[model samples]
Target: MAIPKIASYQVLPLESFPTNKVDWVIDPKKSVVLVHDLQAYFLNFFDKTLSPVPELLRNVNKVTESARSAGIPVVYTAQPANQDPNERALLTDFWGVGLTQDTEIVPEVSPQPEDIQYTKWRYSAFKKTPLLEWMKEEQRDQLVIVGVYGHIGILSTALDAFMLDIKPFVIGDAIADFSKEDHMNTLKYVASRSGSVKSVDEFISSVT
Candidate 1:
């Protein structure tokens, strides 16, 4: 089924993370900022003319910028612009095309010279990458996740992060989804089963 393009999305009616189910601590020394799957091709799912894109870019900048200044590592997961059946595996069968030959990370929150870029073939950034290795190397466990496709990669990454015992924090305004309902559903599942969700302001304020 073709996913509905979200006509309207909001940061409010936010999913409240139950304290018992999710952690509240976000220590800079113990955190790695995740800018997941922000490539241009995947971004085409949204209206981009208003609402989500602008809000997403603005908040994502807050995360990448604050993480840079606070001695935290900012990492991005970018799939190949050109996807082959083998390269994408079930993703090709399940979803749709990802990056193209010329697609790139949107400039608003592009990776810096020191930022790590992981080629993620699967939904979870943890899969087929050295993300866990880097986390272990840095002695960090918290992941402040921001990216597109809220019900896809972002949700998968958050669920996997929880399974790995890393704290996952989804910055509300910094993400988009195929539908407003899917986005909301993802938040509910994450807060209930995996991790916490934060408003952009709430997360940005924590960096310092």
Candidate 2:
């Protein structure tokens, strides 16, 4: 399902990353895969043709396959299709109606039968979710993130992961945002400060 985005916003081209660092390579023994809010409704924010949707899907799929092959656990985040007023009224103020219909996680990187899929009400995947406990249970300290709206749920999750002492490895090419600035700014900030950012190919190679 091709999700819809506001056509008023046009995604510009990404620039060469000038000031950033992926300080460390991913360690498979201590890593997990985090695919956030890849639902069709949320995904529709990117124009399938003009945006980086095609590339994001292909690269993220590689991350998923490589992570699984390396014995890393994969977890996915999805928003409520019909959120309670108190639970999501605030969100609606920013993102209207919020997946009212035909909202499904896109098939390209859809959750496998063995994968964990949970509903998330907050921007941070760890907030109000069992992800932290799950990570502890799995004894993982590194997280690889790929999904839509780089500056929203993805950014929140990355920051939260770092606050908890978990290293977040955000895939640059595998994340989509309403504009190039939103996408690149989040990546650069994470790479420059809180976490590391790289392409999916680089992330998979580091882990595998």
Candidate 3:
């Protein structure tokens, strides 16, 4: 079977690691920041069984700060492992074991009273969730997505946003994957087509 085409947007390349340059700017009123799957169980096995969680969390915190300062709405997503046995079974099938409630969003990036929180069972945040409705109600047309596993959850959510006509700005450095090649490939793929790949600094400066 043929692989699906990834989405992309216009953006500049990063020349160095810790530059203060921001390539593009997004309107804070129209943009929403999405924090995806930063749960504890996922973080617990990150280095040995998964990718690096510390780096991912670092990026998440930076983006969160930037978004909050810019007055953009932040949405946090967590998988409720206690929802159903079938859900847990499915997670185990894909991830190797059932997750517990502790697998929910980490305390550092936990949703505040002002932030929106949603429980998602599928890869796409919009799947079986009121995310779209919430966005519509808030009049948000752009999404800045930061999370773990570029090829799975992040990619799926970006694609869903594209299909729904929502512009996506993906945080490239903020995302991690099981393989370095997969991570780079996913970034290139997305940058080639519905969303643009940006670093946390780039995204923050743009929105802030």
Candidate 4:
């Protein structure tokens, strides 16, 4: 498949990151912020299995704060573990794990009464959720995605959004995956396709 042309406002060396440009101006009415699969089960891997939660959470929190300040709707998706042992075949067969409610959204990025929250069973946020309908109802045309497993959920959701003709603005620093190569490759693919890639700082400053 051909790579998509990614549209980046600015590129900074990974070492010189944590840029404060996220406060840039953005129209809240036309944009919605999405935080994908930041659940405890998922974070457990990063915090324990890996070593990138603190940094990922920091960046995502920054984006969330800026989105709130700009009055942009912040949508969160939670992937619950399967309820039935038999029904969990897919998860176990693929990841050797099953779903549980305990794997729901982590408290750090938990949804408030004002925030929109939904449950998804698949990689794509829109798969079994009311995401698309809600967006259309709000008349939102753009999305800003952030979360763990950039190559999985984040990538799937972004691709689905593109097919739906929704503009996606991927928060680069806020996403993490099992491998650095997969993470970078996903970003590169999105960027190549003209996807807007921004650091948390860039997004916040632009929206502000």
For all the candidates, what are their Cα RMSDs to the real structure? 2.2, 3.3, 6.8, 7.0
lDDT pick, better of 1 and 4: 1
TM-score of each: 0.89, 0.89, 0.80, 0.81
lDDT of 3 at 131: 85
Q: What are the per-residue Cα lDDT tens digits for candidate 4 across 1-208?
A: 2112222222234653333322333457789999998887766654332345666777788888888888899999887665455644465556655555566677777776899988777788888799998999999878899996778888888888878877787777888776666677777777666356677776877787
lDDT against true structure, model 2: 0.79
Candidate 3 residue lDDT tens string, 95-133: 544455686677767777788888877888888888888
Model 2 TM-score relative to the real fold:
0.89
Cα displacement (Å) at residue 75, model 1: 0.2
Q: Which candidate's lDDT is highest? A: 1
User: Stretches of candidate 3 above 4 Å error?
Assistant: 1-13, 16-25, 48-52, 85-97
Residues 1-208, candidate 2: write the lDDT tens digits: 2333534333333356534565677899999889898888776665665547777788788888998898888899888777777878677777665667646788777888888997888989999899998898889899889887788788899999999989998888778876777877888788887888777667767876
Candidate 1's error at 4, in angstroms?
4.8
* Candidate 1, 1-208: lDDT as tens digits: 3545567666544444323365576778898989998887677666776777888888899888888999889999888767777777777655666556535788777889999998988989999899987898888999989997888899999988988989999877778887667777777788777898777767667877
Best by TM-score: 1
Candidate that beats the other on TM-score, 1 or 3, i.e. the better one: 1
